[PDB]
Amino acid sequence: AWVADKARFYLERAAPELREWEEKEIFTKDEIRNLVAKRSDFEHLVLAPGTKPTDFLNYVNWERSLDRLRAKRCARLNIRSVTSHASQARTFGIFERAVLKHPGSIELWLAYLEFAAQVKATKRWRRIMTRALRLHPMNASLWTLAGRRAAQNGDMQRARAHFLRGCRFCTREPTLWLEYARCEMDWLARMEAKKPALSGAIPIAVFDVARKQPFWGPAAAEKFFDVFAKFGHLSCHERIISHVVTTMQELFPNHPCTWSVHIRQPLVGVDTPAFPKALRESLARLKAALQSTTDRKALATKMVAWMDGILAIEKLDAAIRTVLEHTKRSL
Amino acid sequence: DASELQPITQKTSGTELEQTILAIMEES
Amino acid sequence: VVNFLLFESAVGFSLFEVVHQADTVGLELPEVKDAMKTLDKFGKMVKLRSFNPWTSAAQGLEAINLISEGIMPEYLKSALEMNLPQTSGKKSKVVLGVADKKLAGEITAAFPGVQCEAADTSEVVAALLRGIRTHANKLHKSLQEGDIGRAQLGLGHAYSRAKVKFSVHKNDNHIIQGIATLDALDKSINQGAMRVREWYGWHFPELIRIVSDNITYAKVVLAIGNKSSLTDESVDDLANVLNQDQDKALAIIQAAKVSMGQDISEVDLQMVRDLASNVTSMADYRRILAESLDKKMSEVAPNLQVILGTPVAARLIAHAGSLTNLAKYPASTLQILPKVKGRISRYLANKCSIASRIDNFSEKPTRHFGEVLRQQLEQRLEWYAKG
Amino acid sequence: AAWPKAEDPALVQELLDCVQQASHYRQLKKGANETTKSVNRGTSELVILAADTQPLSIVLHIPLICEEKNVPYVYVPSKVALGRACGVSRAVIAVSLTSNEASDLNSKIRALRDKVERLA
Amino acid sequence: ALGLRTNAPNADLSEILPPEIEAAVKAAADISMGTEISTEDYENIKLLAVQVVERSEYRRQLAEYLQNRMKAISPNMTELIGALVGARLIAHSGSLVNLAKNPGSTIQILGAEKALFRALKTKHATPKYGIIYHASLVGQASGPNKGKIARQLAAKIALSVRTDAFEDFPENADDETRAAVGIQARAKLENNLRLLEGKPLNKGVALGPNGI
Amino acid sequence: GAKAGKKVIVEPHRHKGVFVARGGKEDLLCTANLVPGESVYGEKRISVETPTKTEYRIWNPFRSKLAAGILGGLETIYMKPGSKVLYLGAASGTSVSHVADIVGPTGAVYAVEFSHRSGRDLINMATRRTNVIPIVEDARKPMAYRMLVPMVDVIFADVAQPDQARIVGINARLFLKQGGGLLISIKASCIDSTAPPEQVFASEVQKLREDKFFPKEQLTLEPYERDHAMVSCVYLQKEFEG
RNA sequence: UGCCGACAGCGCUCUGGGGAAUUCAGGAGGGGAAAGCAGAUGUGCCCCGCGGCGAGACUGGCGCACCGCCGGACGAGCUG
């Protein structure tokens, strides 16, 4: 190859900050000797033809912990002149050659994105997310992280851009559809907290297109109900709950998931006197679902999972807890 | 600039879903 | 001066931004050709912009159908959005490299700011694309899942079969191998029959001395137990096995009374009836396959099934190899597969040749031409009876 | 099914004419079995196939072998008229003609197969 | 157990074989290229599989039967060399008294008689054994070791089969006192095997770096 | 005939992969078939008890012009066992199977055909033989199977068409490695059927040289199928492989 | 295709000729290899300069197949 000369370039890049650190009393001769030798060995094995992104991450964490230790020793030594910028830039060069070398390691992608999100390279992080998202169009994890950090920063329009493109591409799994409805209703809850948006028809619409999505499953609609049932403290939450219930009751009539949501429907914003009354109403719904002709083992597994969750919620009456125990044992 | 993702509009409207949400946001 | 290019592949489709792209004057040259050839001089040429794999086999298949038509799917269009900067060409445009002329024209229609460039015109992007398909596995390995050989393999199989309607009228493999099975198991039935026949006759030879139909021999030994526990019409067995009251069971009883053979150990009798049960089960499977082959032969080649009969017609088609082979065969070839008998042989060879080409070349076969030709051979049998 | 059909406008008539020429000139095999044997001996120069037949599957299998041998064929619309052109006193659905390399009949046949190749 | 490759993902397989095989079969089913068939044919396919699996189980219980019977017929022989082995020997023999008529080296050269008379007719080298190769106890040696154990094994085979076919027993005679002969042979030949194998190798003048 | 049952001998021929079997009063040509024991089209075959899995197939010249060429003793047929070969004119697949048996498992041949039912026979053989890829389309528009054909090394062509030179020229423009190779075969009676055949061949080879080919061998398969030829050229270099 | 082989000739080669071990100096080929230093400057900010996108609004003149052209200069929002 040509590794000797390319590493000559990179070690000559590394030279002057170490010269600064040696004219400082922060690191001694033997220490900087050890450092340069380690960096040379690192960069050599990095630029080796037969290569792997694990060793790439090794060099990554090595330079990162270098910046950390030098910062700590600088603070202990009460020095102010030396910065971390050259260390950041050489870390970026390591990452840049890493991503040009392996376009196939999503874990290393996320490692780069985490390092950038920690060190405050805003526009850079946006553009790197752009590149890698173009590269891997088939990870809802990537699409969700993009739209999620955009929704976190507050660019809801760019969040919609990322999420809408991800919905346009990924069409085999409903997971990013779940998370998109999650962030849309979370933005709506943010609007209600800062208190069209008065209607809040976007989760209705995304369910309308999900109804003919290729991954169209009854259990998928059940998970849609679950994520809609999260954070029920809103305005049109009863509206969307009624809509999804009547939609899946119109489409999957005798499905055990339809019976499960018919059980767990009116518990949208429950946690107080309104808790046990709705508990008894949903228990009547549950007894009706039990006596109705559906897949009783499937419905009972659904209800025993949800009832184990209910038992995980504390602050209840012992008579209620024991009759849940009885109705659980009788399945 | 192909360095980022500028947000979507009816010109770059892809599907029925995008058409519906863009109709809602234009109504907004 | 090109910027990007698409590329179509059996595993997916991609686009690439060319940086330090190729000379347009310098294209006949040896050095530019060897530089194109070597990967070590071409990665600096082409950088990956983005990649897109297939979701499903039917998805990539319909993609092939679309691109062979020249028309595109909205998800490649989505990739064009997902990697193209939005514009129209009011001040600036973007150069895309496309192979097929219809494809390039349609993308230019779909997007105003793009000049797509079909390689059919452009020797430039043709040469670029040939470098692409040159190193098309080694610009992907880090991101490519698995391989491309088996992908091209299965995908081409499916595309061929879709365009040709393959499985909807090929069944002769099942036909002839079912025939092979029936012959194999039938001879194995014969061997099991003779073996367990002499093998039980060591204990009791009057069963051979009276009883033929070795499957009925197997039934009566699995029902017989030992030599001493005999009665004629015990429960639900000999009435439908054979004549039960006055013809056979009494003769079996008196044969066991006059019997002389060696008394058998119990585990040996267990072995005997294990063997006999095996014999009966495989004979039952023979009758199952016989009904099955009659049905399948009726489904695929009715005219032959009526003119010859399913066993012999299936013998001939198996020795042929395929119905297409049978159709390919000439008449004297069908002979190879007094004088009046050879004359009839030639005549029936002609007629089954015609019935064969009929059945091989009807979409959903019929029966009536086989019926009328069966009547032709019947009246020809009458004609040769008149002599 | 019989998509390389010969069109009407006297093209079929030049076909039947050359059939008459070759039938007198003994360069002719007549009947489908003769066609298959001639094309599987590779002596065939061209073969004409009727489309007026009780089921067409015979003159559908014959194009399979001529496709397997890369020598031309053409669909006349009339088995009766082809048989009359050959002079059989009987209808024929398949007639083939071979090559004899010293004539101008071969020039005629070259023209005819150029015609059918432009048809295909 | 697998139905169709349509029924690839819902079929249960781990009962017959470990995964890392029975996941790759599901992968091969998913991206396979075998042609689509009918259930009217898959009936016949699965029923033929039923045939052959009942056949294989029949062979299995048949072997178990023959093992019981070999234990019954010749305790020395089955305790020494293997039931299926002595089964091959009696198969060539014709009967047990027939085999006990033959001398031991001939026992060593049962079966391979085509090669035997080839060699005897052309004065070639003579073949070294018979069914004794696919017998077990010769399996552990190497070359000349294999040959020597084959000969001595044959001698004890002769002795033991004459024992089993001609030593009378009072019928309150246990299998172990019936087969103690063959067990003696097994122990003594096992020690013979380990000694002939652990023949010390040949030493040599060990050199220094100068050859010193 | 060298009748069924005659003990024969087989040895390698000059070419990497093909074999020649001599015997008695008649020798012939064979290939080790990949798919075991099974005939294709009533072709004769050869079994050897190797000291089961060792089977060869006799190769009729008169059915397959590649075999005509191997009898005509070509300079270099370019197809090593384990090589990528675009076939063209793959009608009913016999010769194609032979090339398949040449290249074996580590090779692959892309079998393109125009019509349908010859396609049916071809794809039947494509089910059976695990290294030949069926493609049934119009050869004149190779962008259709641009999805299927990668860059290959060797181009077989046996179509009988007027635009044959341009057909294989754009297929060379699309699917042939740097320093590529090709065998094509030509009939005078289908390129232009009044002229003398040698002149027709010169016209076709000059065409390919205008398609930037380097003509590097020619022969005339003379005692086997009149006034044809096999022509061997190299794509865009003077030497063959690299 | 077995050895042995006299003169009389031809062929190579001759620090004799083989065979084996072993050091080195070269060669030629095949398979594999992401094999890629086209000009290498930390992040974040806003501002300037300049550039693209980009909603919307205009206008000039032409148009005897009459169906449409071609051109300028303003411009919310976005970006480098």
Structure keywords:
part of a larger assembly, 6 chains, E: about 210 residues, mainly alpha, 9 helices, extended, F: about 240 residues, alpha/beta, 7-stranded mixed sheet, 5-stranded antiparallel sheet, 6 helices, globular, RNA-binding
Would you kindly provide a written description of the structure presented here, covering whatever features stand out?
This is part of a larger assembly, with chains A (331 residues), B (28 residues), C (387 residues), D (120 residues), E (212 residues) and F (242 residues). Chain A is mainly alpha-helical and 331 residues long. Helices cover 75% and strands 0% of the residues of chain A. The longest helix of chain A is centred in the N-terminal third of the chain and has 25 residues, at 53-77. The termini of chain A are far apart. Chain D contains five helices and four strands. A four-stranded mixed beta sheet of chain D has the order 1-4-2-3, with helices on both faces. In chain D, α1 (11-24) runs parallel beside α4 (79-86) and α2 (32-41) runs parallel beside α3 (58-69). Chain F has 242 residues and is an alpha/beta fold. Helices cover 24% and strands 26% of the residues of chain F. Chain F has helices at residues 65-72, 94-103, 117-128, 164-174, 188-191, 197-210; strands at residues 9-12, 19-22, 28-32, 45-47, 55-58, 84-88, 108-113, 132-136, 154-157, 180-187, 213-219, 228-235. In chain F, α2 (94-103) links the parallel β6 and β7. The relative contact order of chain F is 0.13. Chain C binds chain F through residues 8-10, 33-34, 36-37, 63-64, 67-68, 99-100, 126, 130, 133-134, 136-137, 148-149, 152-153, 155-157, 159-161, 163-164, 166, 170, 321-322, 324-325, 328, and chain F through 39-42, 108, 110, 116-117, 119-121, 123-124, 126-127, 130, 133-137, 143-144, 146-148, 150-151, 173-175, 177-179, 236-237, 242. Chain A binds one RNA strand of 80 nucleotides through α1, α4 and α6.
| H and E string of chain A | HHHHHHHHHHHHHHHH
End-to-end Cα distance of chain C: 91 Å
Structural class of chain C: mainly alpha
Task: Determine the fraction of residues in helical runs of chain C and give it as a percent range.
Answer: 55-70%
Neighbour order of strands in the largest sheet of chain C: 1-2-3
- Rg for CA atoms of chain A: 28 Å
Globally, the shape of chain C reads: elongated
Short summary:
Chain D is α+β, with helices and mostly antiparallel strands.
Write the topology of this structure.
The structure is cut from a larger assembly and holds chains A (about 325 residues), B (about 30 residues), C (about 375 residues), D (about 120 residues), E (about 210 residues) and F (about 240 residues).
Chain A: H1 3-23, H2 29-47, H3 53-77, H4 85-101, H5 106-118, H6 122-135, H7 140-153, H8 156-169, H9 175-194, H10 202-210, H11 218-229, H12 237-251, H13 256-264, H14 274-291, H15 296-312, H16 318-329
Helix pairs in contact in A: 1-2, 3-4, 5-6, 7-8, 7-9, 8-9, 9-10, 9-11, 11-12, 11-13, 13-14, 13-15
Chain D: H1 11-24, E1 28-30, H2 32-41, E2 44-50, H3 58-69, E3 73-76, H4 79-86, E4 94-98, H5 105-119
Parallel strand pairs in D: 2-3
Antiparallel strand pairs in D: 1-4, 2-4
Chain E: H1 24-30, H2 39-73, H3 75-80, H4 83-93, H5 96-101, H6 104-108, H7 113-122, H8 144-166, H9 175-197
Chain A binds one RNA strand of 80 nucleotides through α1, α4 and α6.
